[PDB]
Structure formats: structure tokens, C-alpha cells
Amino acid sequence: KEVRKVRIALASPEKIRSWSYGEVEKPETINYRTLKPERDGLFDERIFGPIKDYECACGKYKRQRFEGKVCERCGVEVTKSIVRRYRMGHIELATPAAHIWFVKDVPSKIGTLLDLSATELEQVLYFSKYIVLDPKGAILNGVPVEKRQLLTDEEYRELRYGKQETYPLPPGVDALVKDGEEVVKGQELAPGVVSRLDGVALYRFPRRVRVEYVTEPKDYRVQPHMNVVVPEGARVEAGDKIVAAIDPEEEVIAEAEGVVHLHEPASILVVKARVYPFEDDVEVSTGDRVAPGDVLADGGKVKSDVYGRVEVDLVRNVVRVVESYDIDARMGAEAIQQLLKELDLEALEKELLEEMKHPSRARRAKARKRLEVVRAFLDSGNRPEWMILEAVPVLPPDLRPMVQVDGGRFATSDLNDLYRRLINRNNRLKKLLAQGAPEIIIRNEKRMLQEAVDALLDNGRRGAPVTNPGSDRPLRSLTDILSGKQGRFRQNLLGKRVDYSGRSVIVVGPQLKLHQCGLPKRMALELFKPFLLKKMEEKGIAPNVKAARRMLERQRDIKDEVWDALEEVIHGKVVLLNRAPTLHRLGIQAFQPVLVEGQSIQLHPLVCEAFNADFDGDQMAVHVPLSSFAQAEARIQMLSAHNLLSPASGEPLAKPSRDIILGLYYITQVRKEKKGAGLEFATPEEALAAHERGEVALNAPIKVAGRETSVGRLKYVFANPDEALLAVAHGIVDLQDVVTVRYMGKRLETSPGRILFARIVAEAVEDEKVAWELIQLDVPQEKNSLKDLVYQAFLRLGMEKTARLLDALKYYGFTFSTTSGITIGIDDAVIPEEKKQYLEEADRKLLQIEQAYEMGFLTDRERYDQILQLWTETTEKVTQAVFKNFEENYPFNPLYVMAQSGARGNPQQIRQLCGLRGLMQKPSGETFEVPVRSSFREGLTVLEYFISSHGARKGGADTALRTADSGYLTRKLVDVTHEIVVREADCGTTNYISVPLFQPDEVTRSLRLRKRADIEAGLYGRVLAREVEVLGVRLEEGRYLSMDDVHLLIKAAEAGEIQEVPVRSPLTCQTRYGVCQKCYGYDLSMARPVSIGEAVGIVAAQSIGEPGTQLTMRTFHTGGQGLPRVIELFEARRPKAKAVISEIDGVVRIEETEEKLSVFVESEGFSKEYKLPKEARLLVKDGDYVEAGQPLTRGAIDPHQLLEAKGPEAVERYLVEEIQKVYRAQGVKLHDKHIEIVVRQMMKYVEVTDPGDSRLLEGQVLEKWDVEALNERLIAEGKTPVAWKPLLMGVTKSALSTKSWLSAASFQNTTHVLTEAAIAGKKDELIGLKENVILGRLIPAGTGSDFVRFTQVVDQKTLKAIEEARK
Amino acid sequence: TSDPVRQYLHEIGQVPLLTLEEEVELARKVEEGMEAIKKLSEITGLDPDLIREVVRAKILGSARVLDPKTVEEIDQKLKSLPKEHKRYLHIAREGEAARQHLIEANLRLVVSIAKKYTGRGLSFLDLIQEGNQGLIRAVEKFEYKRRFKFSTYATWWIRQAINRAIADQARTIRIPVHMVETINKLSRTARQLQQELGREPTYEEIAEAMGPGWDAKRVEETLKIAQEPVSLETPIGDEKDSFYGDFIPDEHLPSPVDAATQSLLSE
Amino acid sequence: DQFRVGLARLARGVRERMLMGSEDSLTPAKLVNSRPLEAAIREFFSRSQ
DNA sequence: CCTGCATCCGAGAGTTAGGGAACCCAACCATATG
DNA sequence: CATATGGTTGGGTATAATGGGATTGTCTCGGATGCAGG
């Protein structure tokens, strides 16, 4: 069966034990002599499977045919060895351990369920404090103890055992009290000892004993090595012993009858306890805990009166009950698990539901948050106690290998060391438990075991990470394996290394066609090797595939016919070329390979811009699509000749550049001469004679008979283009002279070069009328004109003819650029004379500003600002002077022509080459006071060079450090939009958006028509939502807006007939997990309605991300709010320079004091006030009108405030406009559709304000579609609908909040996503692209779309046969 | 909160030390409790280990987790003996308590000894825990009648436990204790012959310096078996992107060429 | 600096040897283990970035 | 009792390429050889 | 199937010893949270 869903859930100890094929009991990996796995070790074949195929460990069963045979002598099943990478093991922990994912991921699941803080949970889990599970009527400090109370070790012990204190006694100092007498607090027990607690005092090691004799006394000294046997105040008999000693001769036998007393105690032990003498056998022994009214001794004559612990001292025949209790307080994962098992989820859920009626908002939020976890557990069926580990699963050995390197050394994974530590600590804990060790040692060992489990699951999370001795490197845990840029998801699932691939340096391929690439012969032989083997077998080069492979292995064994076989192999096939970084989809393209000599890939010049490729060492990768489907996709969809327009803007992307533009511009420019300079002639004969005499230039603009013309237009009149070009070939005229030629039935005053360009386009397109319509004959051919020509040719004729035209333009541009004579010399950087004047005037004015400083009229800031402004205007004037000199005196200068044609260069660089370098910035960010007055032709001084180095370094650092924020943004957008596909023809909606055509003035003067480019980017290709009547032209509903329609609408707007356009947009589409054909519009790369199945989300993300990588605030030139603002806009960030907006409508009243300023908005109902700093700038004036959602100051609007005030559509408009402003500022063209898709994903969720009669909770965030469906169901049954408000969240938070746990886990915050999904038991339905890529499936887009992938094809004969069979 | 070394040190420091009188008393009580328990075992006829376990379980209390049925039945039977015998049971209880108190008070010597074995393949806490095991052994076997201080007999057992743990658990591939000692002797001898010779000795020198039964081939094999495995996750290069295991090919699974050859051969 | 680190390790080894041995029969050769110094030098000259 | 306000902690930060320290003594299962 | 050898493993040493070793040049952002005021 096909896999359709993947579910993730918590694992029970029973489930883990059912997974395991056996328990790993020993930390041994392999034997040190034989290199075989040790029994019950981390590599045991009995648990994980045999190392060799169908062969047990001892060799009893060494063949197949015995599947499922468990060796009697070894215990190794007979099966494939590959099972060593699938079969798991387990470790049985002596004590339970907590899974760190559910402890340290804030907020903690265990803490949230049991209402324990993080500090309290940490204290209990790591054996720092106790938690009470049964008070047993205990009292602490006068207050009874309750469940879930934390006791310190001192409080716990004091309550569990009681109070005692030992006071030492120096030798020679006696005790004022007797052994076994009550002592109150403060009762002095010695001349320098004062007690603190009440209870009985007990002598410890009395130094001397007084024994009377029936009377007279005697003394006996007691050394530390000897004890006293007779109790205090007891008579002794002759022959009895008193002071037992190590030596029989040292024993003290009483000589006669006498009483005994003990004096000089070494120490005094004061305890709070009760005393009960007995005279016979006792009932309770030492270490027993008793209650009031329990039998102690004497058959029940004496009875206990208090709760406590019993010690039966036989020396004094007395039972002592120390006041204690039977409290049941525990620490660690055992206690936590006990709390987890006792939890009843339904009752807790009811308590939280009642808690949700409190007027407090914070308390309500806490109850809702706790309820989230409770309900997730209740619905999923997971038991909470499963969050505490008892059986630790063990990864199969082949995924934690211990392999021998070629040199015989061994390499192993860190997981083996982590497992070894865990097993060692578990075994030592078990050994210590079996030995009855004291509780301090056991507590230490249990803490160590918990830390070992934590390190195994997630190392480097709590405390110092575990490292291998002799190194500072943390060991790599499972969490490290899963997550990160080097983790499993991003490194092995969303991207892989592939076969049938190669890489090499690229070289320009000017003779190639648009669909061809030059591939090296050796690379092609290696890439198509199996096909070559099959073809060689087909022919007679080799008898069989093996011999063919052996032949192709050795270079000297290769012959001539194998190359012909290879040429036959690749016929018609295509390869994929790819250059990193792949910023957009045109970074991968399909080409037909032509086999070449050498080791360089040959690239067509027209695809270099799309690849962002050049020839100073760039390398490209080659991939081979294998199957018929892959080849068909590459040849039809990703062929270079089929991708001529940008998917982001709709503008041509394969177009003339560099040398081609230069050549076409050179041949399409006309000469201008000043020899005649507008002279007067009555008759043309006079002009001709003057020119022959030498007074008038050939192309000088003279006036004859009252009309402007030139001697060239009268002297040279050609019957047809062939005659003009023949005259050019004979040196009569040049291509740049203006003559008169009869073409297309008209007499044109044009140059032969422009006629030649017309002939080139006409012969390329094989149609004279359309070609004549497409070209602009009376202008020089530059970048923009050629782009317009290519686009118009595409629209009017098709990509095939467009590709032919592009190739013809490339060929002729190169040909004419070669012979033009374009070169750069040092004199070509012409220095204008005016610059000198401009400099002296400044050296004059500067002195004046200094005088302005010698009389006190100017401050530091004023003088600095004025100097800076002076130098800025001087730089601007010098730029203008340079370009005016170029235009007037040297109209054919190489730098000028290069910049003017759009081939290379901008005015600032020419100004630096010719005029002056300008002002420079200090590393602190402030400008210097002296500018660089030298250009690059004159040469800089040492100081100026060093001064400019600061800006050069700053630009380099900026580039290197920012490119990663742009890449990050692109990744975030791919993850938030990857699921959006075109899924149907029409969603049926009647909603739309209104594209505006005018904008408010910066001084609020009036409305100004928007720029043509912005209107084009917002209107081109869209579907009209409503019928439009403009300029006597009817645009029907459902009409895709072409460029001509956009131009017509702009012209109508300029006549006041229309102010806005209603169109469909993705912002208002109702298709689930995607859009529809009408709400998307035109496929911008094809200028035709988008096909169903297109992954428009990926295209949108790429289109937004590509320009920011390079063109945002590419190499920076140090010569006299870009990406950050876009990232801030896409993340719904609140601005730090936030402005103030008018929440309501009203009139403005400015209230000004000398110390404070405020603005009152006075409505008819209410009047609110806004206090702002005095230094601020106000966009409003006293007595003005402002609407709801309007700003009152300059700055950025907070999107969340706008959402609260004005609503969803206003926020969508603001986001789109503000994102587009940044891109327009840099000159990047990008249609609004992509940003609209991303914003639609941003505005996806809602928050429940009133649940009504639903199971939802107030404040519960959920998808707007789910709540709409739920409300529809509610209405159908007839209950109270849920009340909700829309939410706005950034791209990161929207992407992490998706329904699919696989994509969210592979994006970011892997541990949190996985823990939440496991708690909830989420099922991934595999809707988007990331999930299907991870599972290695067919993505539901393109040829994998359900709309197209079930198509069948048949020929007529089979169809008629089937029809007859049906009949 | 963190740094478990500080927590363990504080918990050991919360127990006061012992004087000679307390130490000798505790040793006497443990010894007489062992004698009393063997006397009970002889009287009742049961296994001494089982009565030791039930006495220890009843002392440790309910707090510490043979099931409660057998412990209760045998305890009640033990609480049935006539007089002059149950006294032994009481002495056994006091002796077990003395054993616990002795270990609890002498834990600090374990830390003091174990603090000088760091940097040998075992963490600080592991060395302390093995020293605690050795201390338990020394306490159990200690004989006070010789008038010697406890620490003198405890140090030897603590060192033995630490050394055995280091020999057992320090290496990923376990090498037997005698072979580990052989490797250590090889290293010491080579180091001394390096210092003496003013250069690294050749294998013949070490073989000659070990004694009879050692040749250069055996020395080479011993150094080869003493090699420790390297990590598959060893970082290669300065950037955090290349691991050692990225450069190791899989030699187990058959290649596509090999599988195709076998299939065609089968055909 | 690396030599100083190795020398400090050597000094620690010297102290441990002094305490663990016998004050009566002790020589400079027995007290000094030069392995840490060589190891530090090798690490610096083979593993330092 | 509510609220806001610093405060703390945790998770991010572009692609491709290439690169690499005790010693001893005695019992006991395992494996080898016939 | 029957031993005989090395390899492996468990047990032992008795003046007295009693709390360890590193810490250091980012930057922002968002949620959790304890503390202050009213």
C-alpha cells in the first residue's frame, strides 16, 4: 500500500521493550583479539543480527535456504546482514529517568502538567530537594505538611528522624547533669557548654568510673579502645565485668559489692525523645517506627505515646522513642513518575475549565495553556507517565558503526561512548543497590545516571557538555544528529549527493545555439557510461558489458569507434547545468550537449546573466536525467530556449548584453559634425558645391530652401538597402552617415546601419511587415530598446522565432563589436577643463566659511555641515560637467558609449575615472573634512588612498556579513510558502482587490499619478474582477490584463476617467493549500495564463529572495533601510522608531508648553491625547482632519496596531506597499503577486475571543479556514458560532505553526516541534512539497499534480478497436 | 544547582568526622553484629545472606524499596525466638547501623584519594563512586582488633577499586586486566629507555628490556592492540562542516555494478 | 606558552611522585616524567590552527 | 488584587568547492588439538 | 567427544592519610518571569 500519512507519538516502556530484540547488558563493543562483537555487548549478533549474509557466528549455518533459523550454539538468526541497520536494542534502567526533551523545553510539559516551576522541577529531578507524596500527619514548624511540598535535606531529615546534638567535653571537665535526665533548652551541661534543644542527655564515652565497695569508693580509667558495660546507677557484683577491654588482663572485674557511677564523658548527646524502661523481653526492635498506644515491652504494660522511631538500648534496658514520622517523601524521576501516574486528566480538565471563568486575564491565560497540554494528552491517548524513561532504546549498530580504516585503525561514533557511560553507570547503580549502600552514595549514583541519560539524549543542554578525555569537543548526541544545518534533515533529506554528475570550469561558447552546451568528451563518457556500455554491446566494439567495462577502464585501451558510439548515445538527450548559488529557478537549465575536446564546459553567452556567471574561474555542475519522464520534463519545461522571460517580473531575461549591445549601438549611432553648423543655402546645388569645396561637413545640419537637412541626404540617395550597403562596401559612405534610402515604399532619411539592423531582424524573423512593426528605427539600439524588441517579438511570434532572433542578434552584435575599434587608453578618460574652475571656486568659498568661523557666526556643526554640502554640490557639478563634455565634444568616447548604451558603467564610476573621487567616510561613520580631489587618471596620493581604504573595507565586511541574513530570509520564505500550488481553474469567489492609481503628495498638496513601472508591476497579468468602461473601450470581466491593456488603463487614468482597477488576487482566493488560475493570473515567464499544477509558492519565495542577495543596502565603491526593513516587514516586527497613528477620527488640537507637547484628537464622542517628545516632527496641523488608521507623525506604522484599528485589508495593502518601496528604491522589478502570496500566508490565523458552544478555548490560536468550517457546521446544526479575530504573525512564527510536523521539524526549532507533535500525536497528511521530498515521493505539483498526472494517450487504431470491443 | 561535584562535596561535608572512640565503637558494633547474625542463622537454620538482607531491609525502612512478604514472615519468625537469642538480633541491628554510619563518616577519604587519578579515561564522579565501592569492601573486611586506624586499611581497598575500574572501563575496546598491565609496563619501560637513551628506542631495545619471552614482533603486536579508536565525528577543517566519517566509504553493501554482474551471471 | 603549560604539567607529576614515593631514595630522573612536555609541543606544532 | 518593566534564557545567523600514571597470586571457563 | 594449555577473572596488600578545577572580543529577538508601582 502507498504511504499517505506519518504519525509520531510517545513511546511506552512496553512499546520500547517490544521494539528491542534483546537487552544490552555489557558496555563491551568488540573483542580485542578477534575483532568480533562480544556477547550482550553493544554489537552483539544475537541481538542485532549477523555480520555476514546468511551465516551465524560460529559457522554452523553458512548458507542461505535457512531463513529464520536461530542457531542453537550461538543464538544468531540466519538472514540478510542488512538487518543490522534496522534492529534495535534496549537497556533496563535500575531507576527511572526523565526524558530531557520534556524537562528543558520551556515551558516544561511535566512542569505544566503538575504545576511545578522550572526551578522546583530541576531541584526535584536532580536530587536537591524532596517532594511529599503522603504527609502521614507530619508537622513542620507548627504547620501541618501537605502534598506537593518541597523539603530541604535538613527539613526532611529533622522530620523523618528527629533532632539531636553532640557537644564535646574537653578532658578534665565534668558534666553538671546525670545520664538519662531531661534537659531543657538553655540548661548548661558544662561550664562552657550550653544546650539548644530539649530532651534527654546521654553520656558518650565516659573517661572514668567510680565503683564503690561495701563503704569505700575506687576509680577506674577508661581508654578510648575500651568500653563500659554496666549501666549508669546500677550495682555490680563480685566477678562481674564493668569495663570490657581488648586484652583479657586489662578487663576490670569488680572485687566486691558496690554501686557504679560514670564520670567525665567524652561527649554529650542531647536528643528529643521519650524513655521507657523494661524488665523483660521487648516487642519492637531498633529501627522500628511506632504510633501512640502501641506495644513496646512487658507484654503491653508500657505503651508508646507519640509517633517516632524505636531504639532498644540493652545496656540500660530501656526503649527510647525519638519523635519522628512515617512521611513518604521522595526525590527524583521515581517521585515525578509517581506524580504522573496518579494524575486524573478528566478532573484536572474540569478544574481548568472552571478556572477559565475568572475575571483575571493572566490567570485565564495560564489555565488555557495548561489545558492545551491536558487536552492534547487526552485526545492523543498518550499516557503522561510515558514521559519518564524506564527502558532506554538502543540504536542499531550499523548507524553507530565501529569500522576499521584501510590502515587497520578503528573509527567509532560518539553514541558508542555515550551508551558505554550509560551502561556502566546503570550497572554500578544496580551493584550499589544490591549492597545496601548508604543513601548519600545511592543519591550520587542516581544523579549521575540521570545526567548520563540527559547527555545521551541531548548533550550540551543542561550543565557542562560531556567531552572525551584529552579533548574539548562535546560528544555528538542524538539531538545534535537530528537538528542543525549539519543535521539529518537539512544535510541528508532535503538535499543529497547524486550519481551521474560532474563539474568543470566554464568557457564562453559564442558559436553555440541557445539550446546547446559544450560538454567535454571524457566527462560525457563518464556520465553516460551505462548507456555507452549498452550501445557498445549493441555494436561490435565489445562482446559483452563486462568486456566493455574493462575496455573503458584503461585509457590506452580506448579506440575511435567508442566515440562514435557515445555520439549516438547522447543524440537528442539533454543535460542539466547548475551554478551555485542557485538563487532562482533559472540557476538550473537544460541544454543539448555537443561533444568537444578539452576539459572545459562551453556556455552560451545569453544564459550567463540568468546564471549570474562569468569567465574568471567559475565552475558549473552537470547532471543527467535518466528516464523518459525526466528527459521529457527537461526537454519541455527546463530547456534554456523555452525560458526567455523572467518568472518574477515578466521582463526578458535572455537578452543582448556586453559586446552585443556595444556592436548594435555602434552600428545604429549617427555621426554629428560641426563644420557646416547650420549654414544657409538657397538651392541644394550651392550646398553640394560648398561641401565639395570643404566648407560644410557631410552630416552637418544645414538648412536649404527653408528645411533642415544635411549634404549627405541630398548627395546620396539610394534606391534600395542593397545599393546603400554596396556603397558602404566600396567606402563611399560609412554605416554611421545619414543618407536617404528607399525602403518599404518610403523615402527614409536614415543611416545604412539602421537599415542593416532592420534587415537583420527581418531575416531572423523571416517576416518583413512584423519586423518593421517591432523595431524603433530612428533611435540608437541600446539595452532598453533591445529588451522591448525581444519582448514584443516573443508576444507577436513565439519563443522559437524569438530564440532565432536572439541568436541572430548575438552573432551580428559580436561581429560588429569586433570591427568597431572599441578600446580604452589613458587619454580616453577625458578631464574637463571646467573642473579646474570648480576647484578654485571652492578653495575660495572655503576660506569664506573659515572667516565665518573666525567671527563666531558659525558653530562646529554648522561649519562641518556647510563644508560637507559645498563639497557634495561640487561633486555633483563635476559629474554633470564631465558628461556634458562627453556629449558635446567626444560623442563616441569609449567610456561614454559604454555607459550610454547600457553595456558597462554608471555615471559615478566615470566621474571617479574622469572628474574626482569625492568625500570619504571615517571608520566611525562620519565624513572627512578634506575630499579626495584626484581622479583615477591623475592618480591618488598615499593619504587619499589610505583614507578611501576605510570605505573599501567597510563595503567588503558589509557584503560578507549581510549575504547570510538575505539567505536566511529566503529560506524562511520558502518554508512558509512551499505548500501553495495552483490547484483549480476557479475558486468561485466574488471578492477582489482595488489597485490604486494615485498617491498623496509628500506635502499633502494633492494626488499625483503613480509611476508607470509601479502600476505595471501591480496590474500586469491580473484578471479583471469587474467590467471596465474606459475611453470607449470595454474590458470584460475575466479578462487577463496584457501590457497593452495596462497602458490603455494608464492613459484612461491620465484623462480622469478612472481612479482604481478591480482585480483578482491571491490575497482573496479561497482555494485550500493553494490558489486558482483566475486568482493568480499570468505565468510571468510565458506571458500566458498560468497552468494548473504550478508551484507558485516556491516561485514567489525565489523571486523575493534573489534580488536581496546582491542588490540591497554587489561591490560597493567608496566615492563621494534596505534589506533590514524588508526583514522587519516580513516578520511583523514592531518598529523601534514607531510612529503614532489616530485610532479614531476627530479634529487636531496641538497643546504646547515650554516643557512638554501633546496632540488632542477630538471626535464628536470622545477626545484622546497623545504625548510625544518636543523634538519630534508632526505631519498634522492644528484644526486638521484625520481618519481612523491615519498616522499623526513621521515614521513606520506598527502592523499589529493597524490590524487592530483598520482591519485585515488595510494591513495587506500597507505590507505590500512598504515591501515594494524598498525594492523600487534599488531599481528591482518584482510583481506584487509574490509578495501577496507571502502576505496571505502571514495573515492565515485567527484567535478565539468567545468559544460559544464549541470545544475551543478563549485565546486559542487556530487557522482561519478551520474556524470558518467549524462555524459553518455550527450554523448548520443551529448553535452559537465561535467568535474570533484575525491575527498577524511573521513568516517564522507562521511557518513553525503549520499543521505538518515534518516540514516544521525540518525547518527550525526541531526539539520543540518534535516534542509538541509527539505529545499531541500529530499526523502529517503530506500536503506540501517538503514532506514529499523528505519521504522521497512525487511532489503534488507540475507533472506530479493530480490534475494532469492521470492523463492517458492512445493512437486511433487502438481506440477504434476498443470502441468495437465496447460495442 | 549545577556542578554535581559541589553538591556531592556539600552532602559529604554535612556529616561530621569521627574521633578514635567513635571509630572503635562502630567497628566493635559491626563485628559483634556479624557474629550475632551468624548466631541467629545457626539458631534458626536459615541462610545467613537472607537474614542479613532482611535485617538490612528492615533497618533501611520502607523508604528504600526478595519481596515484602518474605521479609515480614522471616522478621516475625525472628521476633519469635526466646530470650538470650533475640539479644543477638538487637546486636545485629546495631552493627548494621554502625556499618552505615562508618561508611557515611569515612566517605571523605574516598574523595581525597580519588582526586589524584583524573585525566586517565574516567571522570571525577566515577572515580569517587568506585572509591566508595572500595570503601564498602574495606569496611566490611576491616578488623579493629589489631588496634590500627581504619584509614590505613581503607586506603588500599579504595586504590584497588579505583585501579580496577580504570582498567575495566577506560577503553572503548575492552582489554583484559593482565594485558592492560602489560601495556602499562611496556609504556613505563619505553619511557625509561627513552630518557636513558636520549631518543625514542627501537622495538628491539624494549624487547630486550622487558626480559625473556619478548621479541620485537610481540612488542609491535602489543602496541598495535593498544591503539584506541578515533571518532567518526572528528572535525576536519576550521569550518564546522566536515567530519572524519565523511571520508570513509562503505565496503559492505554490493555496488550497482556488482549487483548487475551477479544478476546477469544468474541469467 | 605551550612549553610553560607542559612544564606546569611536569611539575604536577613531580609533586605526585614526591609524595607517592620514598624521600630516602629519590633522584631527579625518577621524579620527572617528560611525556606531558613532548605531548604539549607536538600538539602545538601539529594541531594549532 | 491588577498592571507595566526591566531581566533571563534560549535559538538563529546563504550556497558550492576542498580539506584529514601498581603489583601479585590463585582458581576457572574457552578454545585447541587428537 | 576428551582433555591440556594459556588466557581470563576474582581477591588481596594493615603507620597515617579526610571538601576539586576552570572561568573572558557578537547581535538581535521573542517569550517567561520576578519585582515595582498603583
Ligand SMILES: Nc1ccn([C@@H]2O[C@H](COP(=O)(O)CP(=O)(O)OP(=O)(O)O)[C@@H](O)[C@H]2O)c(=O)n1
Ligand atoms: N561569498 C560569496 C562570494 C561570491 N559569491 C558568488 O560569486 C559571484 C562573484 O561575483 P564577483 O564578486 O566577481 C561580481 P559579479 O557578480 O561578477 O559582478 P559585476 O560584473 O557587476 O562586477 C557573486 O556574484 C555570487 O554569485 C557567493 O555566492 N558568495
Ligand SMILES: [Mg+2]
Ligand atoms: Mg562578473
Ligand SMILES: [Mg+2]
Ligand atoms: Mg566569477
Ligand SMILES: [Mg+2]
Ligand atoms: Mg546622389
Ligand SMILES: [Mg+2]
Ligand atoms: Mg562544505
Ligand SMILES: [Zn+2]
Ligand atoms: Zn552458529
Ligand SMILES: [Zn+2]
Ligand atoms: Zn481564487
